[PDB]
Write an enzyme that holds these catalytic residues in place. Structure first.
Site, PDB file in Angstrom:
ATOM      1  N   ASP A   1      -1.891 -19.237  61.043  1.00  0.00           N
ATOM      2  CA  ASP A   1      -1.412 -18.526  59.872  1.00  0.00           C
ATOM      3  C   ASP A   1      -0.620 -19.502  59.033  1.00  0.00           C
ATOM      4  O   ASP A   1       0.099 -20.350  59.579  1.00  0.00           O
ATOM      5  CB  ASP A   1      -0.515 -17.332  60.225  1.00  0.00           C
ATOM      6  CG  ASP A   1       0.037 -16.656  58.982  1.00  0.00           C
ATOM      7  OD1 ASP A   1      -0.684 -15.815  58.426  1.00  0.00           O
ATOM      8  OD2 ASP A   1       1.162 -17.021  58.540  1.00  0.00           O
TER       9      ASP A   1
ATOM     10  N   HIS B   1       7.408 -11.302  59.110  1.00  0.00           N
ATOM     11  CA  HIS B   1       7.935 -12.162  58.054  1.00  0.00           C
ATOM     12  C   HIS B   1       7.877 -13.664  58.348  1.00  0.00           C
ATOM     13  O   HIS B   1       8.236 -14.449  57.465  1.00  0.00           O
ATOM     14  CB  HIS B   1       9.388 -11.773  57.728  1.00  0.00           C
ATOM     15  CG  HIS B   1      10.345 -12.009  58.857  1.00  0.00           C
ATOM     16  ND1 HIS B   1      10.023 -11.754  60.174  1.00  0.00           N
ATOM     17  CD2 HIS B   1      11.611 -12.493  58.868  1.00  0.00           C
ATOM     18  CE1 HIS B   1      11.051 -12.062  60.945  1.00  0.00           C
ATOM     19  NE2 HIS B   1      12.026 -12.517  60.179  1.00  0.00           N
TER      20      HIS B   1
ATOM     21  N   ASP C   1       3.059 -13.518  62.739  1.00  0.00           N
ATOM     22  CA  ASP C   1       1.684 -13.131  62.405  1.00  0.00           C
ATOM     23  C   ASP C   1       0.696 -13.658  63.438  1.00  0.00           C
ATOM     24  O   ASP C   1      -0.229 -12.949  63.852  1.00  0.00           O
ATOM     25  CB  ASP C   1       1.318 -13.643  61.004  1.00  0.00           C
ATOM     26  CG  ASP C   1       1.702 -12.653  59.892  1.00  0.00           C
ATOM     27  OD1 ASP C   1       2.577 -11.787  60.120  1.00  0.00           O
ATOM     28  OD2 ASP C   1       1.114 -12.731  58.786  1.00  0.00           O
TER      29      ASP C   1
ATOM     30  N   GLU D   1       1.882 -19.452  55.347  1.00  0.00           N
ATOM     31  CA  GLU D   1       2.531 -18.767  54.247  1.00  0.00           C
ATOM     32  C   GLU D   1       2.648 -19.759  53.108  1.00  0.00           C
ATOM     33  O   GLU D   1       2.665 -20.972  53.329  1.00  0.00           O
ATOM     34  CB  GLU D   1       3.915 -18.241  54.654  1.00  0.00           C
ATOM     35  CG  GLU D   1       3.848 -17.316  55.890  1.00  0.00           C
ATOM     36  CD  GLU D   1       2.916 -16.105  55.648  1.00  0.00           C
ATOM     37  OE1 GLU D   1       2.907 -15.579  54.513  1.00  0.00           O
ATOM     38  OE2 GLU D   1       2.162 -15.711  56.574  1.00  0.00           O
ATOM     39  N   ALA D   2       2.723 -19.242  51.889  1.00  0.00           N
ATOM     40  CA  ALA D   2       2.630 -20.097  50.720  1.00  0.00           C
ATOM     41  C   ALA D   2       3.462 -19.514  49.583  1.00  0.00           C
ATOM     42  O   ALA D   2       4.118 -18.475  49.723  1.00  0.00           O
ATOM     43  CB  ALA D   2       1.169 -20.281  50.314  1.00  0.00           C
TER      44      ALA D   2
ATOM     45  N   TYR E   1      -8.012 -17.219  52.355  1.00  0.00           N
ATOM     46  CA  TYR E   1      -6.684 -17.745  52.085  1.00  0.00           C
ATOM     47  C   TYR E   1      -6.358 -18.952  52.958  1.00  0.00           C
ATOM     48  O   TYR E   1      -6.333 -20.072  52.448  1.00  0.00           O
ATOM     49  CB  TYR E   1      -5.627 -16.655  52.251  1.00  0.00           C
ATOM     50  CG  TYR E   1      -4.353 -17.023  51.522  1.00  0.00           C
ATOM     51  CD1 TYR E   1      -4.216 -16.797  50.151  1.00  0.00           C
ATOM     52  CD2 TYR E   1      -3.307 -17.648  52.192  1.00  0.00           C
ATOM     53  CE1 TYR E   1      -3.052 -17.158  49.480  1.00  0.00           C
ATOM     54  CE2 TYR E   1      -2.152 -18.004  51.541  1.00  0.00           C
ATOM     55  CZ  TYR E   1      -2.034 -17.767  50.185  1.00  0.00           C
ATOM     56  OH  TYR E   1      -0.878 -18.121  49.537  1.00  0.00           O
TER      57      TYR E   1
END
Lengths: 215, 215
Positions: B14, B174, B179, B16-17, B117
Site C-alpha cells: 500500500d 490511516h 491497510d 499513500e500520496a 493507483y
C-alpha cells in the site's frame, strides 16, 4: 553532555537468535523502528508516533535454534527454511544501511541489554561478512542503563519496567517487532529526560566489539 | 493457469500520496509486507503469520498534500519535514530492491486498487529516477479483482470486504501498514483459492504503465 551533538533519530532495535552468547549464536529475526527525536520532544500505554519507519526481517541462521530459543520466539531453523528465509548476507547488510540512510544523522540505535547481546551480535554478523562499515556511522545506547538512570532520578528487564510503568504486561513478547514496540512505549514515559541521557551517553557503534568473529 | 509458475512470495503493498492521480501525486508513505506462500497454503479475523518481513517508510513528497489526503492519512508535507523525511530517491529504490531480494522468487505484489493507483504510482516514482529496473523482476495483482472473483465463486472497497467477511471494521485505516495488515486478513479468508487466482493472473510489473513520467 553533548559528546557527539544531539542524536537526531532513535532506532529502537531488537534481534532474536539461536541461543545465548557462549553458543556463538546466529540472528533469526531483527526489527528496527526509526523515530525522529521530534516525536519525543514533549499512566497508560501511549500510542506510537504517527511518523515512524519500521523494518522487521526473519533470517536463516544456518544452525539449529536451541529448544529454549524456539519456545521464546516461535521460530525454528526448519520453519525459517520452509518460508525460504535467506542467511545474513551482503544484501541484508546493504538493506540495513539503506534503511539507516533514510534517517537524519546522528543515528542512535537503542536496544534493551544491547551492550551484552544485540549490539555485539549485530557487529559479529557484519564482521563475518567484512561489512562492519555498514554500521560504522551509527551511535548506540543500552536502554537498561538508560531506564535505571531515569527511574533513579527492582528488575530492569523490559517486561519488569513495562509493568511497573503501565500496570499491564507488554503484548507480543515473542517477536522482535513486539519487543521494539514495548521498548518504544517505555522510552515514551519520560521522553525529554531519556533524550538528555541518550545525548550524553551515545557511543560510536565502531567501539562495540563483536560477540565473535574478526575484531 | 500457471503463466509464470507458482508465485513464491506475496508482497502485500500500500502507498499513500499527496492526492488523486490527476494531480500527479507523490508518495508520502509505503508499506510492504512479504509473506511466503507457505503461510497461506491451508468467521473472526485471523492472526497474521508468525514469519513475515515488513517494511514501512514515510517519504517527503516535495509538494503540498491536499487537505483530503491529510485528513485521510494524518500526514502533511510540513509534518514529514519536521521528522526529517527524505524524498523518493536512489537510496529508497535500492532499499526496496534489497527488501525484495530477501524474498524467494517469483515475487508478486498484492495491492487493493493497485492497477489504478499503487502500481502506476510506484512505477512513476521509479521512472522519475530512471530506476524502473528496481521492480522489473516482480509480478503484481490487484486484490479488488481477486476478491471479486473469490466472492463470486456490493462494494469491493477494502473496508467493505473486511466488514462483510469479519463483522467488524479494520483497525488503523490511516497508515499504510494498517491497510496492508487489513488486506492480509482478507487474503487469509480463502487462502488456497486466492493463491490459485494469483498464480493465474500474476502480471509482470514491467507492463504497468507509470501514472506520469517517462514510459
Amino acid at each position: 553532555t553533548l559528546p557527539h551533538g544531539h542524536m537526531q533519530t532513535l532506532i529502537f532495535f531488537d534481534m532474536e537468535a539461536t541461543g545465548l552468547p557462549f553458543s556463538q549464536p546466529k540472528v533469526t529475526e531483527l526489527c528496527l523502528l526509526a523515530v525522529h527525536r521530534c516525536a519525543l520532544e514533549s499512566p497508560t500505554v501511549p500510542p506510537p508516533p504517527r511518523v515512524v519507519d519500521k523494518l522487521s526481517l526473519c533470517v536463516a541462521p544456518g544452525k539449529a535454534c536451541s529448544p529454549a530459543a524456539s519456545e521464546i520466539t516461535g521460530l525454528s531453523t526448519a520453519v525459517l527454511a520452509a518460508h525460504g528465509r535467506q542467511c545474513f548476507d551482503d544484501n541484508l547488510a546493504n538493506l540495513l544501511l539503506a534503511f539507516l540512510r533514510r534517517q537524519p544523522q546522528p543515528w542512535c540505535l537503542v536496544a534493551h541489554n544491547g551492550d551484552r547481546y544485540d549490539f555485539p551480535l549485530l557487529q559479529a554478523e557484519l564482521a563475518m561478512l567484512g561489512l562492519t562499515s555498514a554500521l560504522d556511522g551509527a551511535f548506540c545506547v543500552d536502554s537498561i542503563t538508560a531506564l535505571k538512570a531515569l527511574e533513579r532520578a527492582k528488575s530492569y528487564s523490559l517486561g519488569s519496567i513495562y509493568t511497573r510503568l503501565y500496570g499491564q504486561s507488554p503484548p507480543d513478547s515473542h517477536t522482535a517487532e513486539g519487543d521494539v514496540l514495548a521498548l518504544l512505549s517505555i522510552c515514551q514515559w519520560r521522553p525529554q529526560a531519556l533524550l538528555r541521557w541518550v545525548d550524553a551517553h551515545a557511543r560510536p557503534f565502531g567501539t562495540i566489539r563483536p560477540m565473535y568473529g574478526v575484531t
